[PDB]
């Protein structure tokens, strides 16, 4: 791989420079190189991996949605035939998006999850596994779709089980996992009641634990609690 | 339009 | 080239889809493919070429500025030695930016400028030649720098001579050329007085011609006149 | 910070 000759610390340093420059494709390539050195990632390094790939796949998902909507307007009654180009270009962006998700999933499987023993690393990686299967599910239409949805659900569920045994209800990883699994239920699994129940229980259990926190921890937890309440406001 | 976790 | 098998009209159609999806690298690759079909570009197709490459090089220029500023903070008295990584990464983004500029310049030279006989096409391409030599000048530091600056100046000057013979003073191409050549004088050529004189004469000659325009032409011209006045406000 | 032509 093209980063094989670069020191691990230099890859981390350049990932941070790439973030500052809003060069997220470079950031992701640097962090892939760092993971492929074979050492476990620190907390900060796990968050650089997540920021890089979330920005890359976020642009692809936004593009895919725009193209899918145009392809939808084209298959309506009265719409002029314009040829294969919209489908072809949606397919090109879809394939690229699937490739990024497969790359992240492959890093998690080789070998980040198997080496992750502490709750804060293992939950973080299992959440990421759920997230990138969720992004695959957003574009899935084939014989595959049920198994991709179940892979997302399974990863999220294992992360949830660990988080509820090992982390306080205010832990930001635990909160963001619950937030994302609730969105999985709403947007992917056709389970809006499950989505709403999880968001409300998560919010209420975090509320009750805020008294234990420092000012800085309180700010970290309440930021994600607000996202839970924003979804509940949208959904109810 | 669902809010997911911020990176 | 990878677009050689795609119809010209399909490349144009996909460039527009890529714009809507904010996929500017794809947009630029589609428009490069369209130019390489060898036919002249329409007005709309020239503006798709310009939008695509301006967005690609704009992201690279923004990243280069962030990295150059960090590399500047590193060469100050008291700054800790952090190794070659900032310079290496600035160099990587610089090389990529130079590659995009060389690609645009190569399309203009093979063969868009030589085939462009109407004032509206020839001025547009010569302006673009000045612009991408200007972006090369922004990062030039070598034995090359004077010749790159002179190449920008020469292209802009030929565009200016044609525009003042062949176009009204309100023509948006003529206005945007003058705007950009004024920025060349201010930012590249160390000629702020020339920059200010050109911006003010351009603005005043356009003001005097607005009475001839339709409401829609008036809106197009006044939008670029406001950019001239915004620069004059910054510079005086 | 100079304004150049909008694409
Ligand atoms: Cl395509
Ligand atoms: Cl580099
Ligand atoms: Na090493
Ligand atoms: Na078509
Ligand atoms: Na371990
Ligand atoms: Na614990
Ligand atoms: Na053809
Ligand atoms: Na270093
Ligand atoms: Na011609
Ligand atoms: Na004319």
Residue numbers in the entry:
A (entry chain AAA), C (entry chain AAA): -4 to 231
B (entry chain CCC), D (entry chain CCC): 40 to 46
Report text from the authors:
Aminopeptidase N (APN, CD13) is a transmembrane ectopeptidase involved in many crucial cellular functions. However, the exact mechanism that leads to APN-driven MMP activation is unclear. It was previously shown that extracellular 14-3-3 adapter proteins bind to APN and thereby induce the transcription of MMPs. The family of 14-3-3 proteins are highly conserved eukaryotic adapter proteins, which are involved in several hundred protein-protein interactions and therefore a plethora of cellular functions. 14-3-3 binding occurs usually in a phosphorylation-dependent manner, in which a serine or threonine of the target protein is phosphorylated and subsequently able to bind to a conserved basic patch within 14-3-3 (21, 22).
In addition to the high-affinity site 1, we could identify pThr63 as a second, noncanonical binding site (site 2). When pThr63 was combined with site 1, a remarkable increase was observed in the overall affinity (∼500-fold increase of 7 versus 11). Most importantly, peptide 11 showed a lower stoichiometry value (n = 0.58 ± 0.01), indicating a bivalent binding mode in which one peptide binds to two protomers (or one 14-3-3 dimer). To visualize the bis-phosphorylated peptide bound to 14-3-3, we co-crystallized 11 with 14-3-3σ ΔC (aa 1–231) using the vapor diffusion method in a sitting-drop setup. The collected data set was used up to a resolution of 1.20 Å. As the biological dimer is assembled up by one of the 2-fold crystallographic symmetries, the electron density of both peptide epitopes (site 1 and site 2) is averaged within the binding pocket. Careful analysis of the unbiased Fo − Fc differential electron density revealed similar observations. This indicates that the binding grooves of the 14-3-3 dimer harbor both APN site 1 and site 2 simultaneously, with an overall occupancy of 50% each. The bis-phosphorylated peptide 11 binds with no preferred orientation to the 14-3-3 dimer, and solving the structure in P1 does not lead to a better structural model. Within this model, we see that both sites bind in the commonly observed N-to-C orientation within the 14-3-3–binding pocket (orange and green lines). Overall, this leads to two possible orientations of the bis-phosphorylated peptide bound to the 14-3-3 dimer.
